[PDB]
């Protein structure tokens, strides 16, 4: 069970950086809309990482 | 119209509307009771 919990923590941590990269891709290609929306969603992952 | 009760159908419709709005408000209050600069 500990292994499982740490794996979930790692996956959430990885998705945080994934959505940061998506925001950067929005900055490169899209506009402030997608760039800000990426971090808007990333809020939840940052919450869950610590909560876990 | 919302504020007059000449028609029974509207009477019933508005009554149910208010009942449901009150139910949702109850849920929200219960949420509060028991408990964007950074991304900007």
From Swiss-Prot, chain A:
<comment type="similarity">
    <text>Belongs to the PspA/Vipp/IM30 family.</text>
</comment>
<comment type="subunit">
    <text>Polymerizes to form rings, filaments and ribbons. Rings are formed by stacked rungs that tilt to give a dome-shaped curvature. Rings form with symmetries ranging from C11 (55 subunits) to C17 (119 subunits).</text>
</comment>
<protein>
    <recommendedName>
        <fullName>Membrane-associated protein Vipp1</fullName>
    </recommendedName>
</protein>
<comment type="function">
    <text>A membrane remodeling protein capable of forming rings and/or filaments on membranes, which then curve and tubulate the bilayer. Rings will form on liposomes, altering their positive curvature so the lipid bilayer is remodeled into a negative curve as the membrane enters the ring. Ring stacks of varying lengths can be seen joining isolated liposomes. A lipid monolayer can be drawn into the center of the rings. Required for thylakoid formation.</text>
</comment>
């Amino acid at each position: 069970a500990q292994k499982r919990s740490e794996k979930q923590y790692n996956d959430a941590q990885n998705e945080i950086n994934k959505w940061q990269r998506n925001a950067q891709l929005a900055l490169q290609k899209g506009d402030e809309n997608l760039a800000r929306q990426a971090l808007e969603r990333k809020k939840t992952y940052t919450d869950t990482s610590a909560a876990l | 119209v919302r504020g007059m009760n000449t028609s029974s159908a509207m009477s019933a419709f508005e009554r149910m509307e208010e009942k449901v709005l009150m139910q949702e408000s109850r849920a929200q209050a219960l949420g509060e009771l028991a408990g964007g600069s950074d991304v900007d």
